[model samples]
Target: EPPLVFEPVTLESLRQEKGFQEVGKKQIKELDTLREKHAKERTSVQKTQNAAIDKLIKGKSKDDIRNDANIKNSINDQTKQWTDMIARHRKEEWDMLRQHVQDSQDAMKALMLTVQAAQIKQLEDRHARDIKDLNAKQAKMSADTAKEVQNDTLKTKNEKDRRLREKRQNNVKRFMEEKKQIGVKQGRAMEKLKLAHSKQIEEFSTDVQKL
Candidate 1:
C-alpha cells in the first residue's frame, strides 16, 4: 500500500471525507461570511472613490473638465486607491479558497485509494479460495484416473478459471468507469462554485463602480 496522503493537519481535506461533510458545510458558511464582508467593504471604498471624483469635478468650472490637471489627478488617485484595495482583497480571498480546494482534492484522492485497496483485497481473497477449492478437486480426480473422468474434470477446472478471470476483469473495468464519473462530477461542481464566486465579486464591483 502507498503511504498515507491525507494527514490530519489538512483539516480542509478531512472536511470533505465521507464522515466529515459537516466540516465542509461550515467552511462554506465561513467563506460566504467573508465574501459578504468583502462585498460591503468594496461598496464603501467605491462610494468614497466616487465621492472624491465628484468633488474634483464639482470644484472645477464646466469648462475645466476639458483641461483641468488638478481635477484629473484627483480622480486618478482615488480610482487607483480603490482599485488597489479591491485587487488586494480579491487576491487574499482567492488564495484561501484555492488552498482549501487543494486540500480537499488530496483528501478525496486518499479516500479513493482506500476504496480501491478494499476492492483489491476482496478480489484476492476470493481468488485464493477458488484456487484452493480447485486444487482439492484436482487431487480427488487424480485418484479416480478413468480417461473420460479425467478429461471432464480438467475441462471443468479450465472453465472455472476462465470465468474467474473474466469476472475479475469486468469488475475492474466497472470500477474504473465509476471512478471516471466521480472525477467528472467533481470537475463540474468545482466549476460551478468558482463561477458563482466570480459573479458575486463582479456584482459587488459593479455596485462600487456605480457609486
Candidate 2:
C-alpha cells in the first residue's frame, strides 16, 4: 500500500501553519523596517559626515591631510558607529528569523503529537470493539457446540437404553458406536474452533504491534 499522508508534518505543510505565519509576518515586517531605517542612516548620515570632513580637509595638501588627526579621528568614529549599527541590525534579523522557525517547528511537533494521540485512541477503541465481537462470537460458538453435543449425547444414551430394554443386541451395538462417534465429532469441532480463535488473536496482536 502507498504511504498515507497525515498532512501536518511536511516542511511545506508546517511552514504555513498559523503559528509560523503569524511570527513570520511580524518578524519580516520588523526586519524590513529596521533595514530601511539602517539604509537611510548609513547613506544620509554618512554622506553628511563625508561632506563635513571634505570641508575640513579642503584647504590642506595631500601630505597634510594624511596626518590630520581631527579628520582621521572623525572618520574612524563615523565608521565605527555605522559598522556597529549595521552589525546589530544584521544579528537582530538573523535571530528573529531563527526564533520564528524554531517556534514554527515546535508548533508543528505539538500539533502532530496531539493529532496522532487522538487517532491512536480512535484506533484502540476500534480494536477493543473488534476483540469484543470476536470474543462474543467465540463464546456463542462454544455454547452452541456444547448444547449440540449434550442433546445428541442424551438422545444417543436414551436410544441405547431403549434398545437394550427391548433386547435388540445389534441395534444396541450400533448405538454404542454412534455415541462414540459423536464424542469424536464434538472433539474435532471444538479443536477447529480453538484453532480459529488462536489465529484471529494472533493476527490482532501482530496488527497492534505495527502501530
Candidate 3:
C-alpha cells in the first residue's frame, strides 16, 4: 500500500488543531497506563518485601533454636565432665583418709601388744627377784619363831656383810701401803749396790795405772 502523503498539515497549524490534540491525548493516555502499571508493580514488590521484613523483625532471625536436641545435650555432657572430676578427687581423698585410719588401727593393735609384753616382762622380773629375797627371809621364819627370828636373822646377815666389806677394804689398803714400802726399800738397796760397783771399778782402774 502506498503511504498517505501530507496534503493537509495538522502539526503546523497556528491554532490548536483537532488532529494534533487527539494525537497528544492518545500519547498521554498510553503513558498514564504504563505509569499506573509500574506503580502497581512497585507497590506489590514493597508489600512482599515488608511482609518478609515484618516476619524477620519478630521471629528468630539471629538467634538459635531453643528446643533443639544438641544444645542441652552438649551442655549436659560438659556438666557431666565436671561431676566426674569432682568424683575422682573425692575418691582419692576418701582413699587417703581410709589409709590414715587403717594405719591408726594397726598402730593401736601393735601398741596393745607391746604394752602387754612389757607388762608381762616387768611382772616376771619382779616376781623372780622378790621371790629370791622372800625365800631368803622365809628360811629365817619357822613355825615356832616367825617375826622375832626373821628380824634377828636379817639384822645379823646385814651386819656380817657390812663388817666383811669394811675389813676387806682395810686389808686391801694395808697391803697397798706395805707394797709401796717394800718398793722403796728395794730401790734404796739397788742404789747402794750401784755406788759400791762404781767405787770398785775406780779402784781397779787406779791399780792398773800403778802397774
Candidate 4:
C-alpha cells in the first residue's frame, strides 16, 4: 500500500506553521457554510457520476437509442400477433425501455473499463517519472538510516565503555599516589615527636643535678 499520509510516530514532526493550520481551519469553516448546497449538488468523487449510465450516454439521443438494432428485432419478434392499438403501443414501449436498459448496462460497462485502463496507464506513467525518483530517494535514505541505527546501537556502547575504563584507571592511579605520599609523611612525623620528648626530659634532669 502507498504509505499512510498521517502516521503519528512513523514520521518525525519537525516543521509546522501556525498560519498553515489556521488557513486549513478557515477553509473547513468556509466549506461548512456551503454544506447544505453541497449536499444537494449531487457531487461525485473522481467522476463517480461520470462513470454512471446517464454520463456514459454522453452523445446519444433517446430517439436514436429507442430505434437501435436490438430494439427493432425484439419488437418485431414479440409484437406480430397484436390485434389492437393498445397492445402494439405497449409492445413498442416495452422494447424501447428494454433497449434503453441494455444500452445503459453496456455504456456503464464500457465506462468502467475505460476508467480502469486509464488508471493502469497513469500508474505506468508515474512509475517512469515520479516512481523512479521516489525509488532513488528511498535507496539513498535506507543506507543512511541503517548507518544511524548501527551507530546508535553498536558504536555507542563501545564508545561509552572505552571512556569509562580510561577514566576509572586514571582515577585509581591518582588516588593511590595521594595515599602513598600522605601515609609516608605521617610515619616520619611519629618518630621525630617521640625522640624529641625523651631528649628534653634527660636534659632537664642534668641541669637540676648540676645546680
Which number leads on TM-score? 3
Arrange candidates by lDDT, highest first: which order?
2, 1, 3, 4
Candidate 2 per-residue C-alpha lDDT over 106-187 given as tens digits, one digit per residue, 9 for 90 to 100: 6765665566556556655665575566556655655555455455554676664554444445545654575566556655
Error of 2 at 172 (Å): 35
- Give me the displacement of residue 86 in model 3, in angstroms: 1.7
Candidate lDDT scores, in order, read 0.67, 0.69, 0.66, 0.61
| Residue 151, candidate 4: C-alpha displacement in angstroms | 23
The TM-score-based order of candidates, best leading, equals 3, 2, 1, 4
Write one digit per residue (lDDT tens) for candidate 1, span 49-139: 9999998787776657556777778889989999999999999999898888778756755665566556556655665565466556554
lDDT of 4 by residue, 8-55 (tens): 642234225566568878988899878956766656543576677565
Per-residue lDDT tens digits for candidate 3, residues 126-186, read 5456546645544443322433444445468677566546555665565567556655665
Which structure is stronger by TM-score: 1 or 2? 2
Clashing pairs in 4: none
Clashing pairs in 1: none
TM-scores for the candidates = 0.27, 0.31, 0.44, 0.25
Off by over 4 Å in 2: 1-74, 97-105, 108-112, 115-123, 146-151, 156-211
RMSD of 3: 27.4
